[PDB]
């Protein structure tokens, strides 16, 4: 873990109130599960390692990083209070990709495939009970 990469997003903080909701359970069991196993998931399964990729400007451009490895930790370690927080994390991850990369770059096509799946699943996010 290089000093030239930022610290990853917070995934543990006892002072932040936590809750299980049926919607968060769906995000873990249906949404994350579906996206994680996708053929195009691998660039998104951990924070962008700008040193290893030789992208020294990455964290100059992307000031709100997010990735599915972080989201998986947040879901598995009950970090969230509600589904909107987690949906926002997914949307941040996609937008980072679209902002940093050229349209039509392979990673953008990969992100777009995952986002299409994401949208289908979120359209079916259950009513909160």
Residue numbers in the entry: 40 to 168
What does the paper say about this structure?
Bromodomain-containing proteins are a prominent class of epigenetic readers that recognize acetylated lysine residues, typically on histones. BRD4, a member of the bromodomain and extraterminal subfamily, which in fact contains two bromodomains, is perhaps the most widely studied family member and has been shown to be very amenable to binding druglike molecules.
As an illustration, PanDDA identified a binding event for FL1 that was not recognized from the inspection of anomalous maps and did not define an unambiguous bound pose in the PanDDA event map. The remaining hits for ATAD2 (13/16) and BRD4 (9/26) were bound in allosteric pockets of their respective proteins.
